[PDB]
Enzyme design. Structure first.
Site, PDB file in Angstrom:
ATOM      1  N   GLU A  35       4.800   1.599  10.074  1.00 43.60           N
ATOM      2  CA  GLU A  35       3.763   0.736   9.401  1.00 43.60           C
ATOM      3  C   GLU A  35       2.472   0.367  10.157  1.00 43.60           C
ATOM      4  O   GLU A  35       1.490   0.375   9.530  1.00 43.60           O
ATOM      5  CB  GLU A  35       4.459  -0.664   8.818  1.00 43.60           C
ATOM      6  N   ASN A  46      -6.195  -1.567   0.648  1.00 45.30           N
ATOM      7  CA  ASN A  46      -5.471  -1.072  -0.581  1.00 45.30           C
ATOM      8  C   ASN A  46      -6.609  -1.008  -1.814  1.00 45.30           C
ATOM      9  O   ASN A  46      -7.616  -1.468  -1.773  1.00 45.30           O
ATOM     10  CB  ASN A  46      -4.511  -1.872  -1.114  1.00 45.30           C
ATOM     11  N   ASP A  48      -6.356  -1.582  -4.586  1.00 49.57           N
ATOM     12  CA  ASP A  48      -6.758  -2.853  -5.715  1.00 49.57           C
ATOM     13  C   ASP A  48      -7.566  -4.007  -4.916  1.00 49.57           C
ATOM     14  O   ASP A  48      -7.853  -4.909  -5.732  1.00 49.57           O
ATOM     15  CB  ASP A  48      -5.422  -3.419  -6.275  1.00 49.57           C
ATOM     16  N   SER A  50      -6.587  -5.776  -2.234  1.00 51.38           N
ATOM     17  CA  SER A  50      -6.016  -6.283  -1.167  1.00 51.38           C
ATOM     18  C   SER A  50      -5.790  -5.509   0.165  1.00 51.38           C
ATOM     19  O   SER A  50      -6.386  -4.527   0.221  1.00 51.38           O
ATOM     20  CB  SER A  50      -4.573  -6.522  -1.680  1.00 51.38           C
ATOM     21  N   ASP A  52      -3.526  -5.117   3.930  1.00 53.02           N
ATOM     22  CA  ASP A  52      -2.093  -5.333   4.470  1.00 53.02           C
ATOM     23  C   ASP A  52      -2.490  -5.513   6.051  1.00 53.02           C
ATOM     24  O   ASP A  52      -3.234  -4.978   6.714  1.00 53.02           O
ATOM     25  CB  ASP A  52      -1.449  -4.047   4.436  1.00 53.02           C
ATOM     26  N   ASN A  59       1.179  -7.739   2.658  1.00 52.30           N
ATOM     27  CA  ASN A  59       0.206  -7.610   1.811  1.00 52.30           C
ATOM     28  C   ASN A  59      -0.582  -9.055   1.183  1.00 52.30           C
ATOM     29  O   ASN A  59       0.271 -10.023   0.824  1.00 52.30           O
ATOM     30  CB  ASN A  59       0.480  -6.717   0.787  1.00 52.30           C
ATOM     31  N   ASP A 101      13.589 -11.476  -1.498  1.00 55.29           N
ATOM     32  CA  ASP A 101      13.094 -11.701  -2.809  1.00 55.29           C
ATOM     33  C   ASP A 101      13.741 -10.767  -4.037  1.00 55.29           C
ATOM     34  O   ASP A 101      13.325 -11.108  -5.076  1.00 55.29           O
ATOM     35  CB  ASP A 101      11.756 -11.618  -2.913  1.00 55.29           C
TER      36      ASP A 101
END
Ligand SMILES: [Cl-]
Ligand SMILES: [Cl-]
Ligand code: NA
Ligand code: NA
Length: 129
Positions: A35, A46, A48, A50, A52, A59, A101
């Site tokens: 990563e 990203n 969209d 957003s 990271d 994110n 989650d």
């Protein structure tokens, strides 16, 4: 800060990630390598809009507030900049919420594509732990 491999393994162990939700320590080190190349200051934008953040590339659409991802959540209740610190506590605490989650470590695309199903304790092999 750019961690060495065994240095980071020992820090993640101290912070309770070894076998957290059933994921052995090598999984977490492998995910951080691909990563962020073990760099706590890594950022990536990203499509969209957003971004990271940090050694585990958390994110801003869901997990942290960066003031520029409209309509996003802040489920870890932290500014995204806290995830870039040389102290990995904030990144580890947030990662524990993510992995809990329901989707496990599949939340990290690099883990799914480069670590899952491989010999992961190879990432810790030879470290003092
Ligand atoms: Cl990938
Ligand atoms: Cl392991
Ligand atoms: Na956010
Ligand atoms: Na640390």
């Amino acid at each position: 800060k750019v961690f060495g491999r065994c240095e980071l393994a020992a820090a993640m162990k101290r912070h309770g990630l070894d076998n957290y939700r059933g994921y052995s320590l090598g999984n977490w080190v492998c995910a951080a390598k691909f990563e962020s190349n073990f760099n706590t200051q890594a950022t990536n934008r990203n499509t969209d809009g957003s971004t990271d953040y940090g050694i585990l590339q958390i994110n801003s659409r869901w997990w942290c507030n960066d003031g520029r991802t409209p309509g996003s959540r802040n489920l870890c209740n932290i500014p995204c900049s806290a995830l870039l610190s040389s102290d990995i506590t904030a990144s580890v605490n947030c990662a524990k919420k993510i992995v809990s989650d329901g989707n496990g470590m599949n939340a990290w695309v690099a883990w799914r594509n480069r670590c899952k199903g491989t010999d992961v304790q190879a990432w810790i092999r030879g470290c003092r732990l």
